[PDB]
C-alpha cells in the first residue's frame, strides 16, 4: 500500500556531501574489518538489493561508524543515523532472513563506499517513485 | 656537536593542531595494523627514546599515513613529512639498528597517538635545550636485548 510522500525527498545532497567529506578524511590502511552485507552474486534485482541493504546499512551506522564525540564526522553520523530512522517509513517488510547476506572483510574505506553508493542509488529511485520500496521481494529473496 | 638554535621552534602548535584534527577525523575501529616502534621496556631513557623513535616516525609518516590527494589530512601529512625532514638536522646520528625496536599490533588511532606523542615531547625538549638530541645514546641502545 501507500507510504509517506515525504520519502520522495528524505535524502538530500547535504547528506551525500557530508558522507563524502567523511570518506575523504579517512586514512587508507590494509586493515580489514568484518561486516555483514548483501551478496550481489545471489541478489541482482536493483530494487530488492537496496531493500535488503537498507537494513544492513542501518546496523552499520549504529554499530560501526564510531567517531570521537562532537567532531565534524561524529555530527555527520548523527545526521545519517537520523535519516536512517526516518526511512523506516519507506521500506515495507518482506517475508523471509539471513540469506542473501554474506560476511564481508574489507577496508573501512571500501565499506564507507558501499554506504555512499546505497544512499545514492536509494536517493535516485525514491525521487522517481516514492512508493518503490513497497515492492514485494519474497521471491527475489527466496532465490538466494 | 651542536645543532642550529632554530631547532628550538621548528615544531609549532600549528603542526600539532593539524595532527590532532587528522586524528579526530579517523573512524574508531578494532582493525589492527602492524608496525615497528620503540620498545619502551628496553629503552626508557626520555631523550634516547625519542632519538630512536624519530627515524621510526619518519618511516610511518611516509609509508603508512596515506590520504587522497589534496585532502585536508593529505595536506597535513605533507606538512609533517616536511617537518620530519627539517627535524633530521636536529638529531645527531648514533652508532650501533634493530636495537630497542618492537612490532606493534594496534589500531591506527593508537599508532597516531604515538606520532602525536612523539612530536609533543620532542617539541618540549627542544624548547628546554635545543642541543638535547646531540646526546650520545650508544649506551642506552646497547642496553637493549
Ligand atoms: Ca557469515
Ligand atoms: Ca515478490
Ligand atoms: Ca642566536
Ligand atoms: Ca617557528
Amino acid at each position: 500500500k501507500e507510504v509517506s510522500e515525504h520519502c520522495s525527498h528524505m535524502i538530500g545532497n547535504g547528506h551525500l556531501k557530508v558522507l563524502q567529506q567523511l570518506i575523504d578524511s579517512q586514512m587508507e590502511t590494509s586493515c580489514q574489518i568484518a561486516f555483514e552485507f548483501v551478496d550481489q552474486e545471489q541478489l541482482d534485482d536493483p530494487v530488492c538489493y537496496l531493500k535488503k541493504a537498507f537494513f544492513l546499512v542501518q546496523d552499520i551506522i549504529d554499530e560501526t561508524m564510531r567517531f570521537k564525540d562532537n567532531t565534524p564526522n561524529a555530527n555527520a553520523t548523527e545526521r545519517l543515523q537520523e535519516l536512517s530512522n526516518n526511512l523506516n517509513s519507506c521500506f515495507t517488510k518482506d517475508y523471509e532472513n539471513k540469506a542473501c547476506v554474506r560476511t564481508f572483510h574489507e577496508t573501512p574505506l571500501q565499506l564507507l563506499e558501499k554506504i555512499k553508493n546505497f544512499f545514492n542509488e536509494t536517493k535516485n529511485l525514491l525521487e522517481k517513485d516514492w512508493n518503490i520500496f513497497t515492492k514485494n521481494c519474497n521471491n527475489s529473496f527466496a532465490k538466494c
Side-chain angles (χ1 to χ4, degrees), chain A residues 36 101-104:
Chain A
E36 300 278 288
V101 176
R102 57 170 282 189
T103 316
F104 277 83

Side-chain angles (χ1 to χ4, degrees), chain A residues 45 48 94 135-143:
Chain A
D45 188 41
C48 294
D94 298 318
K135 169 175 179 175
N136 193 333
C137 286
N138 286 12
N139 292 333
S140 283
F141 289 170
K143 303 186 195 229

Side-chain angles (χ1 to χ4, degrees), chain A residues 41-113:
Chain A
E41 297 294 355
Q42 284 169 338
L43 190 59
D44 302 272
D45 188 41
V47 177
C48 294
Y49 178 97
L50 298 174
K51 199 132 148 64
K52 189 77 186 231
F54 165 76
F55 300 103
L56 301 185
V57 161
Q58 254 188 351
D59 285 325
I60 289 183
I61 287 183
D62 292 335
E63 299 167 356
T64 307
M65 298 186 66
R66 273 290 183 273
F67 293 99
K68 192 157 176 174
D69 291 327
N70 285 287
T71 62
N73 290 7
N75 308 131
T77 297
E78 294 278 16
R79 288 161 63 84
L80 295 184
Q81 187 174 353
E82 178 182 344
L83 172 64
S84 298
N85 301 131
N86 302 17
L87 288 177
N88 277 327
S89 301
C90 311
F91 290 77
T92 65
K93 294 180 295 295
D94 298 318
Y95 172 85
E96 304 287 10
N97 192 10
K98 282 292 183 64
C100 303
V101 176
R102 57 170 282 189
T103 316
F104 277 83
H105 302 275
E106 294 182 350
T107 324
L109 207 59
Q110 299 180 350
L111 177 144
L112 264 55
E113 291 286 18

